[PDB]
Symmetry: none
Subunit: 90 residues, 6 copies
């Protein structure tokens, strides 16, 4: 905080975009990355204070499940200080 | 304001094309993105006025269900100001 | 003469086989070829409505015999936009 | 004329390469195209006289079934005159 | 210069696993591979013991978060790899 | 030295492990890597037929251990019409 990251992965782009907007609506988080690794998987990564990050991912997960298919939801309170040099989480 | 988002996701290009065609016919909307993320999924994104986008999306979902499988249907009336930095939702 | 007919398969060979069967069966023109991943290939032909229908019927038949047919559709009057994405 | 087309589609690159090798060994055919449209699918396209193309595809099909999994086998005796404009079959 | 490898399906499990690996020991993320079908691979390098400790933590985290596909350690990667690998 | 060794696995890790085992097993050269979807990764090696056989067998076993082996194959004497559309050299 404010370096905590929230992670949402859906099966479908529309569920992911819906979740993304729901996440930034619900808390003061910043979208820092989007990953599409195939087989329908789309991942949206947000950063901010750990409290806001959890609020974001909770709202994002609910929206993803309603719009399409939620695959994963996760929070990393303190990412490794050098993680952001290999994965976009800043 | 003319930044409402309409979202359709189907299985396969043909159902998505049919859907996209139905959306632009239905109302004053603009296709702003097309995404292909695997497992047969194809997504069509449109923008325009809220009413136009709602109408286009309804037409999109109906056509999608006829040609193939409709996976997702969604509307975002008032997108977060940061959404477009990172998703293509603008004309 | 601006109607389009669409054949989508899960595999290149079934798509190519369908494409040839279509132009053989009617005086249509292959105008586009789309591959959206995971084996999906779409062939788009253009012509008069009656013949794109005959073409897609022949294409669908051949696609099913050769491989896996995913979709078959005809749009008599497609829009004049769609755009750079479609 | 030597413009008949022989088509083999496999799942897995190894089955396709093995099949491709069997196809040119089996007859007087020439590898014209190679396609990989996702989901493991690999296509091999050969050209030549109809009889040779027939012999090539049967050998390719057998090898593909041995090494991996055969998806499609097809022969087009006389391809449409403008087929080779949207599809590499020369 | 041993390497440790973690592969998952889904980016989320992979990012969590990578984070665990660099936290666990003296390793450095030197590569990342996404070969399709949702598969995501992360590779770290360093001394053997550290690489081993990282992958254990990496595999543990990956299984908790999502689905772990493969976990492996190569104490000394061959030089004849660095052209297509 | 024209023989081809072919290994196909699920996932990058099983493939890299297999590739590593192959180049350590004999005097072969990795000439290609192919990722054609559904999790499939292929590694192709070339060299003398004996070396290719030893490499291929050692790669396949490592592949079974790390992940799943899909295909294993050896082409002792590949046709010359193959190299024009397939990286085997
Ligand atoms: Cl909204
Ligand atoms: Cl043969
Ligand atoms: Na319109």
């Amino acid at each position: 905080s404010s370096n905590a990251i929230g992670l949402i992965e859906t099966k479908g782009y529309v569920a992911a975009l819906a979740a993304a907007d729901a996440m930034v609506k619900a808390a003061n988080v910043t979208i820092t990355d989007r990953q599409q690794v195939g087989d329908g998987l789309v991942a949206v990564i947000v950063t901010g204070e750990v409290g806001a990050v959890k609020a974001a991912t909770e709202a994002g997960a609910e929206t993803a499940s309603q719009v399409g298919e939620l695959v994963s939801v996760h929070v990393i309170p303190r990412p490794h200080s050098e993680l952001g040099a290999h994965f976009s989480v800043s």
